[PDB]
Structures are given as structure tokens and as C-alpha cells.
Amino acid sequence: RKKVVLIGTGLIGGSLALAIKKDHDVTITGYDIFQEQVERAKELHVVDEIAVDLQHACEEAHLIVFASPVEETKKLLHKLASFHLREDVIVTDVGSTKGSIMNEAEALFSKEISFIGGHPMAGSHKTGVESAKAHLFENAFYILTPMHHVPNEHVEELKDWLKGTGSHFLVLNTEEHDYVTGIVSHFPHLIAAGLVKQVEKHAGDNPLIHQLAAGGFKDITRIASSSPKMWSDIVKQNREHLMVLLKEWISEMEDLYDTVSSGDAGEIQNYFADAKEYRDSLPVRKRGAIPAYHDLYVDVLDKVGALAHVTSILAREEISITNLQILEAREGLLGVLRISFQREEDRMKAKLALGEEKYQTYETI
Amino acid sequence: RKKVVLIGTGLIGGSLALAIKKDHDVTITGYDIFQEQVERAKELHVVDEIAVDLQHACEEAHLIVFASPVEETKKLLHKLASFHLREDVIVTDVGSTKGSIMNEAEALFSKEISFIGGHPMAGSHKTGVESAKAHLFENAFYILTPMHHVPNEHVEELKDWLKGTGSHFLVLNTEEHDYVTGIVSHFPHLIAAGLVKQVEKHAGDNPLIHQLAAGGFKDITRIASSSPKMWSDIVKQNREHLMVLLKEWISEMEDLYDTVSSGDAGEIQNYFADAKEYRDSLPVRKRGAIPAYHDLYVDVLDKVGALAHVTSILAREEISITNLQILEAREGLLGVLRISFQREEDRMKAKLALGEEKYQTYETI
Numbered sequence: 001r002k003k004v005v006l007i008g009t010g011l012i013g014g015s016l017a018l019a020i021k022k023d024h025d026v027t028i029t030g031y032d033i034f035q036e037q038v039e040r041a042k043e044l045h046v047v048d049e050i051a052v053d054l055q056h057a058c059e060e061a062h063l064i065v066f067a068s069p070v071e072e073t074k075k076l077l078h079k080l081a082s083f084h085l086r087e088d089v090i091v092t093d094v095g096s097t098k099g100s101i102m103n104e105a106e107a108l109f110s111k112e113i114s115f116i117g118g119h120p121m122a123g124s125h126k127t128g129v130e131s132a133k134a135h136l137f138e139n140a141f142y143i144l145t146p147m148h149h150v151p152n153e154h155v156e157e158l159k160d161w162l163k164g165t166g167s168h169f170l171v172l173n174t175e176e177h178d179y180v181t182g183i184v185s186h187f188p189h190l191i192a193a194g195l196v197k198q199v200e201k202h203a204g205d206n207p208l209i210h211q212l213a214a215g216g217f218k219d220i221t222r223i224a225s226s227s228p229k230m231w232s233d234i235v236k237q238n239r240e241h242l243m244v245l246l247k248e249w250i251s252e253m254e255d256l257y258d259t260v261s262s263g264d265a266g267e268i269q270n271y272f273a274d275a276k277e278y279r280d281s282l283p284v285r286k287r288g289a290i291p292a293y294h295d296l297y298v299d300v301l302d303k304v305g306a307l308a309h310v311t312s313i314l315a316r317e318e319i320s321i322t323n324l325q326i327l328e329a330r331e332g333l334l335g336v337l338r339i340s341f342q343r344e345e346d347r348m349k350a351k352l353a354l355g356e357e358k359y360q361t362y363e364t365i
Numbered sequence: 366r367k368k369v370v371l372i373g374t375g376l377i378g379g380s381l382a383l384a385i386k387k388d389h390d391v392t393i394t395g396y397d398i399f400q401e402q403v404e405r406a407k408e409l410h411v412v413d414e415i416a417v418d419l420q421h422a423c424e425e426a427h428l429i430v431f432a433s434p435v436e437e438t439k440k441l442l443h444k445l446a447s448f449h450l451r452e453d454v455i456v457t458d459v460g461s462t463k464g465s466i467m468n469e470a471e472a473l474f475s476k477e478i479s480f481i482g483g484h485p486m487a488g489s490h491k492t493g494v495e496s497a498k499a500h501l502f503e504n505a506f507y508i509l510t511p512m513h514h515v516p517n518e519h520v521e522e523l524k525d526w527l528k529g530t531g532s533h534f535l536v537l538n539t540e541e542h543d544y545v546t547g548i549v550s551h552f553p554h555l556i557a558a559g560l561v562k563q564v565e566k567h568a569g570d571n572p573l574i575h576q577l578a579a580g581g582f583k584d585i586t587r588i589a590s591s592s593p594k595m596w597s598d599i600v601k602q603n604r605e606h607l608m609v610l611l612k613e614w615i616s617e618m619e620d621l622y623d624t625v626s627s628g629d630a631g632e633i634q635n636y637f638a639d640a641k642e643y644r645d646s647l648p649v650r651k652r653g654a655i656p657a658y659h660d661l662y663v664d665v666l667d668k669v670g671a672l673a674h675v676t677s678i679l680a681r682e683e684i685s686i687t688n689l690q691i692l693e694a695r696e697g698l699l700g701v702l703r704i705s706f707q708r709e710e711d712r713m714k715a716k717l718a719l720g721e722e723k724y725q726t727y728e729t730i
């Protein structure tokens with residue numbers, strides 16, 4: 001009945017189209033600058049039609065989704081502003097940054113058009129539409145950044161359009177999105193590339209260095225092999241946030257130099273202990289975690305089948321697990337399994353079920 | 366038959382004792398400051414006999430292995446020097462740093478006792494003798510740092526003692542060892558802890574960082590969960606090398622600040638391109654100075670029993686899992702479920718076992 005236009009029919013666009021058709025009877029018209037991709041999307045029933053005219057498809061659309069790169073989306077929003085769109089249209093994107101997009105949207109569309117920025121924290125550009133899946137974004141954070149004027153009810157309509165994603169939707173202001181993604185995603189990319197560059201500089205002086213960088217060092221710097229073109233565009237789009245963070249990092253490295261140079265075993269130990277305790281605690285369940293969840297800690301032995309037996313007991317009781325991880329918080333073979341549940345009642349059933357099987361459990365550690 | 370003394374019967378010590386007994390009929394006498402550890406080592410046939418006094422066992426030893434922490438080894442070498450050791454004895458350690466150890470050894474033993482420093486580059490999610498394995502060091506670098514006047518014949522005898530490790534032995538000078546390990550192993554550990562500290566500081570201001578930091582960013586900082594006691598001793602023992610590297614790092618971050626602040630897309634792209642090309646050149650699926658993650662990513666649907674089925678498949682193949690997690694922040698990472706293994710062989714078997722049951726899996730490059 002309703003019409004969706006999808007601009008950029010890759011892995012991300014295609015997976016959104018599949019998530020949408022999962023929960024909605026809609027015609028999806030695909031548009032892509034790479035003709036072969038959209039053709040392939042129509043061949044795979046990811047889209048129902050290929051856009052003959054971009055204007056024509058857009059002017060009949062209830063929903064317009066940009067899955068194009070941020071720089072391309074910015075350019076097309078101008079075109080979108082010159083069209084006569086439906087009164088009820090929702091427009092959204094999938095960009096890794098939101099500041100520049102939302103600046104352009106506010107300048108072009110304010111009050112008239114429901115533009116809501118988006119950022120699904122799953123997927124890649126390493127494959128195309130051939131590997132698209134309705135569940136690509138299942139239990140991924142999906143950040144939405146409504147323009148200042150967009151009523152709460154339009155944001156709920158978009159979450160409804162996208163309910164088939166099974167994403168944890170978070171509504172943030174634009175600055176907050178770029179601030180938080182600057183710290184947890186963009187900044188590590190700068191440091192990963194810097195670590196590789198420092199090893200590369202010394203590799204000239206000793207040939208052993210390239211060989212000893214296999215394994216863990218390669219694993220730690222994984223994100224340094226991501227697209228230089230894409231990451232240079234993100235650094236440009238989030239430049240001011242990253243400049244503030246780099247200046248604070250340099251100050252932190254100068255304090256770390258003073259700690260190391262002082263040789264005080266106490267101070268250095270505290271520095272490693274603080275980092276270990278914070279990292280081990282992630283994610284830190286708080287009051288304001290929008291997806292509210294409930295933790296059970298279980299003492300488990302490091303042996304074949306330990307996790308198999310725990311998960312088998314919870315599955316037989318029809319308890320869904322939202323997350324789990326192992327903490328090395330004991331002395332020998334004993335480890336702690338942290339299990340997260342959506343509902344308090346699931347945690348309670350899990351505690352009872354494991355208690356009857358003679359497991360030690362706790363609700364705080 | 367020949368006599369081995371093992372001083373410190375933990376993970377690394379115990380694994381060496383098992384690798385020794387694999388290829389040699391010997392009596393191994395265990396000595397440990399924690400009585401229950403060496404008792405447990407005897408219970409597990411890691412050692413043949415226990416000593417609570419060093420002198421008698423050491424004076425009849427053909428081989429003495431220090432697998433105590435480097436600060437403790439340094440202290441015990443004095444005691445060893447006061448004993449009347451065999452003419453043919455070889456003495457070795459397993460310390461992550463070699464400068465301080467070799468300084469103490471050269472002061473105590475020069476031209477008299479065959480002391481050869483050692484550093485097997487292998488790790489574990491665990492400490493303690495119950496996690497010791499004959500195969501811990503297979504295809505790992507094992508660095509030997511002989512004192513200046515140790516006959517090369519004694520280095521060959523030691524490689525023969527330890528042939529059951531299946532390690533790649535390298536003979537290095539002491540300074541070279543601490544310089545190379547400073548760059549490829551110690552310095553990254555400092556930066557991983559620094560990154561955690563910076564994110565922790567901002568999590569105070571926006572508690573959303575405590576939630577969105579559990580996925581991707583956890584990857585570069587995984588090593589920050591390693592032993593603070595061990596890493597504070599390594600930073601102490603390698604202080605001067607790490608001071609020089611921190612000052613270089615600060616200078617590199619200042620140049621990176623100038624690049625980012627100039628906003629030039631070309632220059633920033635070149636910076637990421639150089640890092641990507643160097644990282645892509647590093648060896649594939651090989652052991653280096655930092656233990657590799659051995660991560661397998663698995664596409665699973667959010668259903669009751671999804672983890673039960675995956676863990677059951679791996680347990681039926683007798684594969685031990687070190688860790689697992691559901692990723693909620695996973696841009697550039699296909700596969701919602703991440704599973705970690707002790708070694709590449711386990712990950713390879715896990716990929717085959719899950720493949721046979723029609724699970725899609727992914728490994729990073």
C-alpha cells in the first residue's frame with residue numbers, strides 16, 4: 001500500500017529494506033549510482049522496483065532512506081528540498097556522523113519536512129546486497145537524531161517503520177551523537193593508526209619488529225585496515241570533537257610519562273588496576289540504560305562444556321539471554337559468567353534453575 | 366637420569382615442565398612460595414618431587430628454571446650463587462623483561478655458571494599450574510639471552526632441553542630484547558590502559574559511554590584486562606625504553622593533531638593509507654610478541670537456545686571456549702556472537718564444527 005524509496009542499495013540499505021518488508025506490506029523502489037547493485041537488489045527481491053525517476057519516486061514516498069555515504073547524502077538533500085514531497089513523508093539516513101547532515105537538513109527543510117538522522121551500529125561496506133539480512137541490526141544500537149521541530153510522534157512512526165530490525169533505538173541530540181561516537185568509535189581509529197605508524201618507524205632499525213607484530217599487535221590494530229577514504233571523511237566530519245580529544249590525549253600521555261619516569265611501582269600498578277577494573281565492568285548497567293537489563297553472576301569451571309551446561313539449563317527453562325561474558329575474577333580454573341536478562345523475572349528463574357543444579361550465583365560482584 | 370628444578374610452578378613454569386618431560390626422561394623437583402601450587406603440580410604430574418628448601422635440589426640439578434615473577438627471580442639468584450652447583454648446570458628464567466635479570470646474573474655468575482635468560486612469547490586467559498599445557502609454546506617465539514661468555518654449546522643444550530616446546534628459538538642480546546619488546550609489546554599495553562582511562566573520564570559526563578563502549582572499543586583495549594601486578598613490574602623493569610617511546614609517541618600525536626586540525630582530506634587519508642598498508646603486510650595467523658585474540662564471529666538469531674546450540678556443538682568437539690560476548694556496537698564486525706579460543710587450532714576446529722551445522726562464521730583480517 002505505502003511506498004518506500006531506498007537510496008544506496010548495498011549491505012546496509014538492502015538489510016534495512018528486508019527489515020522493513022518483514023513487518024510492512026510496502027513497495028520499495030531502489031536507487032543507486034552503481035547501476036549493477038540496484039539491478040542485483042531487484043534480482044534478489046530486496047527492492048520491488050528500480051527508480052526510473054528519482055523525483056517521481058520521492059514525491060510518492062511515505063519513507064525515504066539514504067544509505068549513501070554522508071558526503072553523497074548531503075549533496076542529495078538539496079535535490080530533495082526542490083521536490084514536492086508528501087505531507088506525511090519521513091526522511092532518514094544511516095551516516096556514521098550526524099553534525100554536518102543535521103546542519104544541512106535544518107538549513108533546507110526546517111518545520112516543513114520530518115528529517116530524522118540515523119546511525120545503525122552494525123554492518124560493513126566490505127560486502128554488497130548479496131549478503132543483506134533482515135536481522136543484520138538485531139540487538140544493535142540504532143541512534144536517531146530528530147531535527148529540533150520533529151514531534152516525538154514522528155520519531156515513534158520511524159521506529160515503527162524499522163521495528164523489523166530488532167535494533168535498540170536511542171534518540172539523541174546531534175551534538176551528543178558526534179561527541180559519544182567521537183570518544184568510543186572515531187578516536188580509537190586515530191590511535192590504532194598511530195600505533196601501527198610507531199611500529200613501522202622502528203621496523204627500519206630492527207627486522208625482528210615486523211615478525212613480532214604478528215598475532216596480538218595485528219589484532220589490537222584491526223581497525224587500522226578499514227577504508228582510509230571512509231575514515232578520512234569521518235575525521236573531517238567530526239574534526240572539532242577529535243581535536244579536543246587529541247589535545248586531552250597528549251596531556252594524558254604527558255602525565256603517563258611523569259608516572260613511568262618516576263618508576264613508582266604503586267602509581268604504575270594503580271594506573272593498570274584502574275584500567276583493568278573499568279574495562280572488566282563494561283558494559284556498566286546504570287539507571288538510564290534505555291534497554292533496561294538485569295545481571296546474574298555464576299561461578300563456572302574452565303572445562304569443556306561448562307557454558308554448554310549453563311545455557312542448556314536456561315534454554316530448557318525457556319529463558320532468553322541478552323548477553324554473557326566471562327570475567328577472570330577468581331584464582332585457578334574458577335571463572336565468573338556474567339549473564340544479562342531483559343526482565344527481572346528471567347533473572348529470578350535463572351537464579352532458581354542454576355541453584356537447583358548446585359551452581360553458586362550472585363546479583364552484584 | 367637428569368634432574369630439573371622448577372622455581373615457581375605456575376602457568377609458564379608448569380607448561381615448560383610438561384614440554385621438558387614430553388621429550389626427556391627426567392626428575393623435575395618443584396619449588397614454590399605457595400605450597401598448595403607445587404602440591405597441585407605434583408598431583409598433576411607436572412613435577413615428580415617437591416622441595417621446600419632449594420639448596421639440596423639445586424646442587425644436584427643439571428637444569429634450573431626460574432618461572433617466578435622477574436622481581437622474585439632477581440631476589441633468588443643471590444641464594445643460587447651461595448650454593449655449590451654442578452659444573453655442567455644450565456640456569457634459565459622466563460621473564461617478559463631481560464635487562465634487569467641479565468644485569469643481576471652477570472654480576473653474580475660471569476664466566477662461571479651458564480646462565481641463559483629466556484622469554485617464551487605465549488600467554489593465557491589464566492595464571493596457575495592447573496592451566497599449564499605441554500603445547501602452550503608451539504610455534505611461539507622463545508627468546509634466549511645468554512650471558513656474554515656462555516659457550517654456544519650450552520645454548521644448543523638448552524634448546525635441546527626445551528625442544529618439546531616446539532618454539533622458534535631466537536638468540537638475542539639483552540638490550541635488543543628489551544628494545545624490541547618495548548616497541549611491539551610493552552608500549553601497546555600502556556596505550557590500551559590510557560585509552561580505557563580517557564573513556565572512563567568522559568563516562569562521568571555522559572553515562573551513554575558506559576553502554577556504547579562495550580562493543581568495538583573493547584577490541585583495541587582487550588589487553589588492558591591483563592595482570593596489573595605483572596604489567597607494573599614490566600614497566601618498572603623496562604622504564605628507560607618506555608620513557609623514550611612515550612616522548613616519541615607525544616611527538617607523533619602532536620603531528621597527528623596538526624594533520625587533523627588542518628582539515629586536509631588528502632593528508633588525513635595518507636595517514637590512514639600508510640597504517641593500513643603496513644598492517645596488511647604483517648604476517649597472517651602467526652605468533653608474535655602479544656598473544657593473538659583467536660576470535661570467531663557467528664551469525665545467530667535472537668531465540669531461546671541459540672547460545673545453548675553453539676556451545677553444545679563446540680563442547681561435543683571437546684573445544685574449550687575462553688570467552689564470548691553478544692556485540693550491541695559492531696560496525697565493521699559481521700556476526701553478533703563473538704567467541705574467543707586459547708589457540709588458532711581451536712578456532713579452526715570451531716569454524717569447521719559450526720560450518721557442518723550451517724552457521725555462518727567470520728574471522729577479521
Ligand SMILES: NC(=O)c1ccc[n+]([C@@H]2O[C@H](COP(=O)([O-])OP(=O)(O)OC[C@H]3O[C@@H](n4cnc5c(N)ncnc54)[C@H](O)[C@@H]3O)[C@@H](O)[C@H]2O)c1
Nearest residue numbers: 373374375376377397398399433434437460461488492493
Ligand atoms: N603470563 C604470561 O602471559 C607470561 C608470558 C611470558 C612470560 N611470562 C613470565 O613468566 C612469569 C610467571 O608467570 P605465570 O603466568 O606463570 O604466573 P603464575 O602466577 O601462574 O606463576 C608464577 C608462580 O611463581 C610463584 N612465585 C612467586 N613468587 C615466588 C618466589 N619468591 N619464590 C618462588 N615461587 C614464587 C607463584 O606462587 C606462582 O605459582 C611472569 O612474571 C612473566 O614475567 C609470563
Ligand SMILES: N[C@@H](Cc1ccc(O)cc1)C(=O)O
Nearest residue numbers: 301302303306307335685686
Ligand atoms: N572453558 C569453558 C568456559 C570458561 C572459560 C573460562 C573460565 O574461567 C571458566 C569457564 C567452556 O568451554 O565452557
Ligand SMILES: N[C@@H](Cc1ccc(O)cc1)C(=O)O
Nearest residue numbers: 139320321666667670671672
Ligand atoms: N537470546 C539468545 C542469545 C542471543 C542474543 C542476542 C542475539 O542477537 C542473538 C542471540 C539465547 O538465549 O541463546
